[PDB]
Structures are given as C-alpha cells and as structure tokens.
Enzyme design. Structure first.
Site, short mmCIF file in Angstrom:
data_model
loop_
_atom_site.label_atom_id
_atom_site.label_comp_id
_atom_site.label_asym_id
_atom_site.label_seq_id
_atom_site.Cartn_x
_atom_site.Cartn_y
_atom_site.Cartn_z
N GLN F 11 0.78 -1.24 -0.09
CA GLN F 11 0.14 0.00 0.14
C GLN F 11 0.78 1.12 -0.02
O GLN F 11 0.35 2.48 -0.39
CB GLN F 11 -1.04 0.11 1.27
CG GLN F 11 -0.47 0.36 2.83
CD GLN F 11 -0.30 1.89 2.92
OE1 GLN F 11 -1.20 2.51 2.42
NE2 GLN F 11 0.86 2.33 3.58
N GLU F 71 -6.21 -2.83 -0.27
CA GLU F 71 -7.20 -1.93 0.29
C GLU F 71 -7.68 -0.84 -0.43
O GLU F 71 -6.74 -0.01 -0.89
CB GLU F 71 -6.59 -1.42 1.63
CG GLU F 71 -5.86 -2.55 2.60
CD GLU F 71 -4.60 -3.06 2.35
OE1 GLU F 71 -4.16 -2.65 1.17
OE2 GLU F 71 -4.00 -3.55 3.29
N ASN F 206 15.04 4.65 4.14
CA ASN F 206 14.43 5.89 4.40
C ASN F 206 15.24 6.76 5.29
O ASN F 206 15.35 7.92 5.15
CB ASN F 206 12.99 5.78 5.11
CG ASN F 206 13.16 4.75 6.39
OD1 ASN F 206 13.81 3.66 6.12
ND2 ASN F 206 12.39 5.35 7.41
N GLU F 254 22.87 -4.84 -20.30
CA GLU F 254 24.35 -4.58 -19.98
C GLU F 254 24.41 -4.24 -18.69
O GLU F 254 25.67 -4.82 -18.05
CB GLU F 254 24.79 -3.28 -20.85
CG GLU F 254 24.91 -3.42 -22.33
CD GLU F 254 23.40 -3.63 -23.05
OE1 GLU F 254 22.35 -3.49 -22.32
OE2 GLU F 254 23.40 -4.06 -24.16
N1 LIG Z 1 7.45 1.82 -0.04
C1 LIG Z 1 7.09 2.70 0.97
N2 LIG Z 1 7.18 2.39 2.14
C2 LIG Z 1 6.86 3.28 3.08
C3 LIG Z 1 6.37 4.45 2.63
N3 LIG Z 1 5.95 5.43 3.82
C4 LIG Z 1 6.38 4.59 4.84
N4 LIG Z 1 6.65 3.43 4.44
C5 LIG Z 1 7.25 2.19 5.23
O1 LIG Z 1 7.11 1.06 4.14
C6 LIG Z 1 5.93 0.06 4.82
C7 LIG Z 1 5.05 -0.38 3.87
O2 LIG Z 1 4.97 -1.74 4.05
P1 LIG Z 1 3.24 -1.96 4.52
O3 LIG Z 1 2.80 -1.11 5.61
O4 LIG Z 1 3.29 -3.65 4.57
O5 LIG Z 1 2.16 -1.57 3.35
P2 LIG Z 1 1.43 -2.97 2.43
O6 LIG Z 1 1.77 -4.02 2.04
O7 LIG Z 1 0.94 -1.81 0.83
O8 LIG Z 1 -0.04 -2.90 3.10
P3 LIG Z 1 -0.56 -2.49 4.66
O9 LIG Z 1 -0.12 -3.75 5.62
O10 LIG Z 1 -1.92 -2.50 4.95
O11 LIG Z 1 0.04 -1.27 5.19
C8 LIG Z 1 5.31 0.78 6.11
O12 LIG Z 1 5.28 -0.16 7.24
C9 LIG Z 1 6.23 2.05 6.35
O13 LIG Z 1 6.99 1.81 7.47
C10 LIG Z 1 6.18 4.88 1.18
O14 LIG Z 1 5.75 6.02 0.78
N5 LIG Z 1 6.43 3.91 0.43
#
Ligand SMILES: Nc1nc2c(ncn2[C@@H]2O[C@H](COP(=O)(O)OP(=O)(O)OP(=O)(O)O)[C@@H](O)[C@H]2O)c(=O)[nH]1
Ligand SMILES: Nc1nc2c(ncn2[C@@H]2O[C@H](COP(=O)(O)OP(=O)(O)OP(=O)(O)O)[C@@H](O)[C@H]2O)c(=O)[nH]1
Lengths: 50, 83, 50, 49, 438, 438
Positions: F11, F71, F206, F254
């Site tokens: 997400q 979601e 991050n 490459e």
């Molecule tokens: N890739 C990404 N990660 C973020 C961002 N902002 C915060 N994060 C961190 O990256 C993680 C994203 O993984 P998930 O929380 O599992 O998101 P998801 O798998 O799409 O689904 P959820 O469990 O519903 O949140 C979060 O736990 C944050 O700590 C962002 O903008 N992009």
C-alpha cells in the site's frame, strides 16, 4: 577573432606597465622622497580629528 | 544433516550487539518506582567518598623521528691533500 | 593614455554604485521599523481612549 | 507619518539614480574598448617597413 | 599552481583571520557581495584569486580557508557579518562545547567526533587544489580551544599528508601577563607535541605590539582591529610573493630550507620595519638604510628578547615595493659589518632577500603608515631560550605543588605526559646553548 | 522496440509510484488532461512516450504501469486525484482484504483470486507491447501488502516468462528502526523465495534519505513528497537511457551482464551525486571532479554500511547531462590511483560509465538542486552482509521464543519453511565471506 584581440589587449596592458615601470624608474628618482605621501596624511590626519 | 553455518562475526557479536546495548542510559530516566526516603542513619565518614587518585606512570609519547641536530662539536673528514 | 583614463573613470563609477546600494538597504530597514511603530501608535491611541 | 512620506521620496530618488547609473555603465563598459580593439599595430603603422 | 589553505582554530584564531580576509578582499577589490564588477576577471577561477580565492563559474570568490571553533558565539555573529555571504557556511565549522582551556578535553573528549567532519572539508578542498604548497595554521598557545583541537588535527593532517609544508602562527604567551594559570599547562603541552611535527612555527607577543602603538604610531588607545591589522599586514606581506612578483620571487620552500638551520628549532622572529604614524612620515623621509636600522633596532621586535643577550643565525628580509639592488646590497654590507649584531660564526652569510615591486596599500579606515619601501624581517637568534627559561621555572614550581591536577585527572589524564614535556623542554634549552656554543 | 512494464505492490508502494509519472509527465510536458497541445505529436503511439506511455489514436498517454493494492483507501483517493483520467480504472488494481503484514496471508489466502486478474493486465499489456525488455517491480520488504502478494506473482511471471528481465525495487528494512516487529519474519520469507528467481533487486533505506535532507538539502522537515521525489528522480535517471540518447547508450541487459558477478547475489547500491540545496548550488559550482569525490564519499550512500568495512566489485556511473570523456576518464583514473577505495583484486576494472546529454530537469513545486552534470552510482560491495546479519540476530531471538507463531500457525503454515530461510540466509553470508575472501 575577439580572443586574438583580448590577447592583444593584455599586451596593451603589458606595454603600459612598462610605460608605468619607467615612470616608477623616475618615481624611484622622485621617491628619493615623494609627495603624494603628503596628500595621504591629510585624509589620515583629517579622520583622526573625527 | 546440514551443519548450521558458523555465524560469521563481521564484528556484530563483538560490536553491533554490544553497540546497541552500550548507547543506552535506561532503567533510569522517567523516574524510580519510588524515592527511597533516606532514614536518618548516617552520612559520609569524616571527609569520605572522594575522587582523589594519584597515579604512577611514565608512558612514552609518540616517536620524534627527527634525529639529533648537532654532532656536539665534532669533525667530519676534510683536508685530504696530495702533493 | 586615452585607454588608461577610460579605465580609471569606470572604476570610480563602480564605486559610486556600491555606495548607492549601501544606502538603499538601510533605508528599506528603517522604513519597515517606522511602519511598525506607527501601527503600535494607533493601538496605543485606542488603549488611551478606553 | 510626514517623516515616513519623506522617506519614500528619498528612496524613489535613489532608485531613479540607480537606473540612470546602470545604463551609463552598460554603455561605456560595452561599446568603447570593444571597438578600440581594432587599433592597428606599430609595424603596419610604420607601413610594413 | 601556487596556492595554499588557511586554518583558524581557537576563538582568538578566527577574528584574526576575519581581518586578514578583510584585508585580503581590499587588494583584490573584492566587493562584499562576492563578485567583481562588469570588469572581465571571472572565469575558470584562474587569476589573482586562484591562489587565494575560488571564484568559480558562479563568480563568487570562495576563500580557501576553514574556520573551526567550538563555541557558536563568535561564529554566529560573523555568520551575520558583512562578508558572511562570501564565506561557505560549513567551512565555518562551529561547535557547541568548549575545551575550558583544557588541552586534553579539546584533544580527547570532543575532537574525535569533529575531526572527521573537518577532514572531509580538507580532502574536498584538497581535490579542488592543484599545487597546494602547504597550510596556514592560525592558533594560540594559551588556546581556550586552540591548544587541544589544533594538536590532534595537525597530527591527523601530518600522517596523511607528510610531503607538504605546514606553517604555524600562534600568539606567544605574555612573559609576565597571564590571563590563565592553566595556560602554562597546555602551552608546554602544545610545544612538545608540535616540535617533531610542526614545520615552521612563528610567534608573536601582544605586549610589545601595544608598546609599538604608543611609541611610533602614537596610539595610546589601540584595538584588536589595529592588532589584527598589523598581523594581517604581516601575513599579507609574506603572501605578496604569491600575489605579485618582483626582481626575484621566493617561496615558503626557500624560506624553510634557508631559515631553519637544523631539525626541531623552526621558530624565527618576524618584524615589519615601516611601522610609523602617518603624520610622522608626513614631514620625514623613509629609505632602505634607516628602516634597516629600525628593523634591527632591538625595541622594534614584538618578542621580549634582547638580541645582544643572544646571537644571530638566520635573517630573512622581504622588500615589498620600489627598491633597487644598489642601496640594498650596500646597506646590508654596512649591516653585515656591524659590530653589535653578533651572528654565529658558523654562517658566513645568513641573508635571504625578497623583492616585490607592488607597494603595500592602505586599508580604508586604517591607522598604518603610507609605505613605498616595506620589509618583513624574519630572523632566528639564540636570545629566545630565556622565554622557555622563563616558562620552566614557572612550571617547575606549580607542577611540584601539582595545582589543577584534579581537573585533568578528573577528566582522564595523568601526570606522565606532564613529566615527559619537561625533559622534552629541557632538551630544547640544552640544544639552544650548544648551538650557541661554537 | 524499447519498452518495459511497471508493477506497484504494497500500500506504500503506490504513492511512490504515483510521483514517478507525476515526475515523468513534466519532462514530457504531459498535460494532466492526457493530451499535448494542438502540435502534431499524436499517432499510433510512437514517440518519446512510446517507451513509457500508450498515446494511441485516441491521443491519451496511457502509462504502462499496473498498480495493485489490497485496500481501496489509497487507491481510490488517487483515483480521485489529478491524473486519474490518465489512469486505467482496473489497471489500478484495488483490493478488498489486507494481508495484515502477514506474508502468507497475501501469499495464500487472497493472492490466489487476485493474481489471475492482474495477470490478465500483464498479457493484455504484453500483447500490445513489441520489445518489452523487462519488468519494473516496486515493492517493500516490510510490505504489508507488498511482501506476500509480490512473491506469488513474481513466481508466476517467472515461470511463464523466463526470457526477459525483472527489475526489483524495495525499501530495505530500516536497520535500527522497526515500525513492525513481524517485519523480520516476512522479510526473510521474501528473500529466500526471491533469491532463486529475482533478476536484480535494488534496495533503499528511508533514514539515510532523511539524513541527506538536513545535511546538504538543508531541510529539517521534508515529507514523502520529497522522499518520493528523490527516488522518483533515481528511477528517472536510470530510465533516461530509454528516453534519450547519449555519447553511448546502455540497457538493463548490459547492467545485468556487467553488475552481477555470479548467480544469486544481484544486490548493488544506488546513489545520486548532485544532491544539494538550490541556494547552495547557486553560489557554488558543479563539475565531474567533486561529484566524483562526493559520489564515493561513504556518508552519501543511502545504506547504513561502511565501504571501508567491505570491498568493491562493481561501480556503474550514469552521467546525465553535459560531460566530456576527458575529465571523466582522467577523474576515474585518479580514483583508480586512490588507495582507500578497495576494489577486489579479481576485477582490475569494474567501471560502467553511462553518458546522457539531457540535463536533469527540476520539478514544479519541488526542492531539488540545479543539475547540469549528474551521475547515478550503481555499485555492489562486500560491506552489504551487515544488513542481513542485523536481521538474523533479530530473527534468531524471536524464533527461539517463537512469538507471533500462533498467528502464522493459526492460518495454515508450519516451521519448516521458517527453518529453510535461516540456512537459505546462512548460505548468503557464507557466499559473502567466500567472495569477500580473495
Ligand atoms: N514503499 C514505501 N514504504 C513506506 C512509505 N512510507 C512509509 N513506508 C514504510 O513502508 C512500509 C510499507 O509496507 P506495508 O505497511 O506492509 O504496506 P502494504 O503491504 O502495502 O499494506 P499494509 O499492511 O496495509 O500497510 C510501512 O510499514 C512503512 O514503515 C512509502 O511511501 N513507500
Ligand atoms: N591572537 C589573538 N589572541 C587573542 C585574541 N583575543 C584574546 N587572545 C588571547 O589568546 C587566547 C585565546 O585562547 P582561548 O581563550 O582558549 O580561545 P579559544 O580556545 O578559541 O576558545 P575560548 O576558551 O572560548 O576562549 C586568550 O587567552 C587571550 O589571552 C585575539 O583576538 N587574537
């Protein structure tokens, strides 16, 4: 061609410091003791009053 | 039977395991379970609880590679002449 | 000698510009302060009316 | 408030002077020596002697 | 090419550099904005600034110095000064905790985490440089932060860079004036550390600096700005060879090779002859002979040492302005044949002349003279050991009664390094008479 | 021809992707409506967009990216955003059930009924595509919906299509920061499943992204908009070779052939050199030398690894902008002369330089620098093993006291799979040591 002119211009600078240096050759003749030094103190003594 | 690979200690066990625990001033900070009220028992003993500690050492400093400047008024070889 | 005189005059002109901007910035700051003070003055007038 | 108004009059005079002086410096710093570079050389003035 | 880097450590070492760079911007006509006028001097950064400033394509003359302190007080104010736009914000390396005059606290407690930062500045300045002859170290023996922090970094820049020169400049502790009684502690600590690493350490004492002011400049009421002006003039004079040319051009390499006789001792004495009030030179005349007499007049030195109580080894004179060899060689011939000047018999000649045509220019709102013939007299003599002789009898008492030790042993130091320096010092004096002894 | 496919899972993997075409539409000037001005650039879909967008006879640039989410919250809000008209409704794959950070829930419970639908997108995108060099996979190891769902689909796209590349991009788990304690569980599950299928997996973190922000970008309070902007710039740079040309043009093949030394390990490090504030760039200068020094400065990497703790194998330079071979080859030659930089002796050369004339452009409402000379630093070193050895000591702690297992054994797993990953990992460092050992 302007670059050839600027290297002509800096040569025109070189000849003039040579004209100056011969002036400084005669300045050294004067700078046995000089007179613009007198002019400088006038401002220095002027500000000191301030 | 696969032997577990000897866990390679690229520091870690030495450092990063101890580095996490070392930069930690906890078990202390928000407040104690209570203030142990000092019962009127005693205090230090005739100017006790000090920080004085006179040590004994001679530790050498780094090496001044820079060698002796003079020859303490001595001679090199000169004056070799032949008629 | 023509070229030398031209260069000297240009240098003096640049110095004059420098002085001008020097004055301008402090004028800016002063007027800002004056405005804030006059606003406080109206407020004090109303407070005195109370 | 009178003093304030006098202040804006001073500053407006200042900026007009700024503009005038900037124009003058552009003109003289650009045209003169750029054309003056075409000045001949001593030997050809001596006539390729 | 012919460029170097300056360093400013100790809260004293930064206001002095300010005035120096304040002086430095005048001779180049640097406007406080950071750019030249429409005049064509900007480019790939290669002009009179290339040895001093970094005026890259942005057109901003970037000074080649890093200012390091541990108290944000002074550095923030100069960050709000007039040329703060010129100065690179993080070249002004600031700190939040002081050394409390403690050499070791400035050498152990906080210097570890900051040197890596400044070392990044050094290498990121090292890469952009091309010739990089050496460094300019501005500091102080009684360094509130100068002592400890400089000592560690000069060790670090020595070990990675041992092929180039390192030029040291510190205010010598006042022989009878002490603004700190722990000042002897770190001062001998600084000296013994630097003896085997410092290339050329040059000193100065402010008491005679003040004495000059109301002697000839007639200023009974001077200021640090005046003090900073003259030392800024002093460093300007030695750097004019890099800026301009002359009959001959000389470099720190020649200075090093020809001034230091033998290892360790690299502590000559600078002096500027034409220090006179403007109105005094108004109706009088200055020439090579009398300034040579003035420069060798014992009271004109800023270090409380009588040359007749010592003997000369080396003398470097740097004539900036209009001179001719005819009077220069004749006057020094009279000087070489002077009885009172007791050179050591070991040296037939000890004279390193530097000639620069460019006259020393005045500073607006200044106080100095109006000089056409200027000379910076750098010299080394045996009359200096008295200062260290003055130092040791002070230290031997206060160490024997071990005052303030609880401070240093409280923060983790102990007596051995203090013990080492005394025979290291005692080595220094015992070398000084034997070179004096023919 | 030259095109690829983009996939966005997790997400939090969608807002970062959202910025990409927000970025991408600017350098192509794509209006949010979906059309250029009346100027003739429309057709069957063949121009600078043809590699990324599908502007068919309808004249609407259609991004070649499938956004899968579990979601409907974040996917619908962007479905109500600004470029939603560009976006294909069911290409924005929404979901009705979450994985609850459980790898297997997204891998077993719901991924089955969703992967078939998203596969239809892939093939219906595959059929219209012509060359389709590879895939762009954006996910996260701590993927709440990224970890589980991606693992299943990457397996499925691997088995049917093994003749093309798949490029993986995931935020590496924050080393000392954990917003979820189950993160070590699903992360090691993803890694062991991907080691034998993933082509090239690229990681970011991050914390160091923020660390740069208040170091040189000078922003103490950036946002995701900036963080997404930075990584969006990174992927934009690597895709500029597809967009524009250069002195030489390179392709992911490459990159693949020359970056990965041996099978398994395909995990280099990426970095962007000209990262500076707008004002700092204004009164400073950019050139190949300092950015070459900056790009190899240890603290500029976005991964918490000390390069001097490890040794280098590969380094790929992506010079976007105006550079010449002369200074570039001279600068890297000096880099080869450097002693601190410790490449492995197996590779005398490990340098892959990429030149692109197009200057990196700024984004409206952005905070980036002024770039005329850029470079992207793709590099792989032996100092990466620290990250996994940070995970396992965490993981071996929880697994022995087997926390949260009731959750996982509750919905249908066992411990054998959790067992495999530990020796699957244990292979990695024992591979890392052997390649580390010369
Ligand atoms: N890739 C990404 N990660 C973020 C961002 N902002 C915060 N994060 C961190 O990256 C993680 C994203 O993984 P998930 O929380 O599992 O998101 P998801 O798998 O799409 O689904 P959820 O469990 O519903 O949140 C979060 O736990 C944050 O700590 C962002 O903008 N992009
Ligand atoms: N060269 C020079 N010396 C100064 C100046 N002002 C004071 N001094 C003297 O030089 C010494 C400087 O050392 P410190 O006082 O430790 O200065 P610091 O190490 O930079 O930092 P502080 O402890 O905060 O003062 C002082 O003790 C003064 O006696 C100055 O402007 N220039």
């Amino acid at each position: 061609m302007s670059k050839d002119l600027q290297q002509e211009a800096n040569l025109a600078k070189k000849r003039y410091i040579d004209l100056c240096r011969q002036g400084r050759i005669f300045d050294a003749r004067n700078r046995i003791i000089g007179g613009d030094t007198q002019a400088w103190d006038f401002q220095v003594r002027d500000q000191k009053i301030k | 039977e696969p032997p577990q690979h000897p866990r390679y200690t690229s520091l870690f066990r030495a450092t990063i395991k101890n580095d996490m625990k070392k930069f930690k001033t906890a078990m202390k900070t928000m407040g104690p379970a209570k203030v142990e009220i000092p019962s009127p028992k005693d205090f230090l003993k005739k100017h006790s609880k000090e920080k004085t500690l006179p040590p004994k050492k001679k530790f050498n400093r780094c090496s001044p590679k820079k060698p002796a400047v003079p020859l303490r008024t001595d001679h090199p070889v000169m004056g070799i002449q032949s008629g | 000698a023509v070229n030398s005189a031209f260069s000297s005059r240009c240098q003096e002109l640049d110095d004059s510009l420098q002085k001008l901007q020097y004055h301008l910035r402090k004028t800016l700051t002063e007027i800002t302060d004056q405005e804030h003070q006059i606003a406080a003055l109206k407020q004090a007038i109303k407070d005195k009316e109370a | 408030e009178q003093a304030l108004r006098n202040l804006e009059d001073s500053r407006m005079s200042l900026e007009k002077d700024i503009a005038v002086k900037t124009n003058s410096l552009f003109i003289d710093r650009q045209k003169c020596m750029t054309h003056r570079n075409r000045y001949p050389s001593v030997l050809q003035l001596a006539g390729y002697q | 090419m012919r460029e170097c880097i300056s360093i400013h450590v100790g809260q004293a070492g930064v206001q002095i550099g300010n005035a120096c760079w304040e002086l430095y911007c005048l001779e180049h006509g640097i406007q406080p904005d950071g750019q030249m006028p429409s005049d064509k001097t900007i480019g790939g950064g290669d002009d009179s600034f290339n040895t001093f400033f970094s005026e890259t394509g942005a057109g901003k003359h970037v000074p080649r110095a890093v200012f390091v302190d541990l108290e944000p007080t002074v550095v923030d104010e100069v960050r709000t000064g007039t040329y703060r736009q010129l100065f690179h914000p993080e070249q002004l390396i600031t700190g939040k905790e002081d050394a409390a005059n403690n050499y070791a606290r400035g050498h152990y407690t906080i210097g570890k985490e900051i040197v890596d930062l400044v070392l990044d500045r050094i290498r990121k300045l090292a890469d952009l440089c091309t010739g990089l002859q050496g460094f300019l170290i501005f500091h102080s023996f009684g360094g509130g932060t100068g002592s400890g922090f400089a000592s560690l970094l000069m060790e670090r820049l020595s070990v990675d860079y041992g092929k180039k020169s390192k030029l040291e400049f510190a205010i010598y502790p006042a022989p009878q004036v002490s603004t700190a009684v722990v000042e002897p502690y770190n001062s001998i600590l600084t000296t013994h550390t630097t003896l085997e690493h410092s290339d050329c350490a040059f000193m100065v004492d402010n008491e005679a600096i003040y004495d000059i002011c109301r002697r000839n400049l007639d200023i009974e009421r001077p200021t640090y700005t005046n003090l900073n002006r003259l030392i800024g003039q002093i460093v300007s004079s030695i750097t004019a060879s890099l800026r301009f040319d002359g009959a001959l051009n000389v470099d720190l390499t020649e200075f090093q090779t020809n001034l230091v006789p033998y290892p360790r001792i690299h502590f000559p004495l600078a002096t500027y002859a034409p220090v006179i009030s403007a109105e005094k030179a108004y109706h009088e005349q200055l020439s090579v002979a009398e300034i040579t007499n003035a420069c060798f007049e014992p009271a004109n030195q800023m270090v409380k040492c009588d040359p007749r109580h010592g003997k000369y080894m080396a003398c470097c004179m740097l004539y900036r302005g209009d001179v001719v060899p005819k009077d220069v060689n004749a006057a020094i011939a009279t000087i070489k044949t002077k009885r009172t000047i007791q050179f050591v018999d070991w040296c037939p000649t000890g004279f390193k002349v530097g000639i620069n045509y460019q006259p020393p220019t005045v500073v607006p709102g200044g106080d100095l003279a109006k000089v056409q013939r200027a000379v910076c007299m750098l010299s080394n003599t045996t009359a200096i050991a008295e200062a260290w002789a003055r130092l040791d009898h002070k230290f031997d008492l206060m160490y024997a009664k071990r005052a303030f030790v609880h401070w240093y042993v409280g923060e983790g130091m102990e007596e051995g390094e203090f013990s080492e320096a005394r025979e290291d010092l005692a080595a220094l004096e015992k070398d000084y008479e034997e070179v004096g002894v023919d």
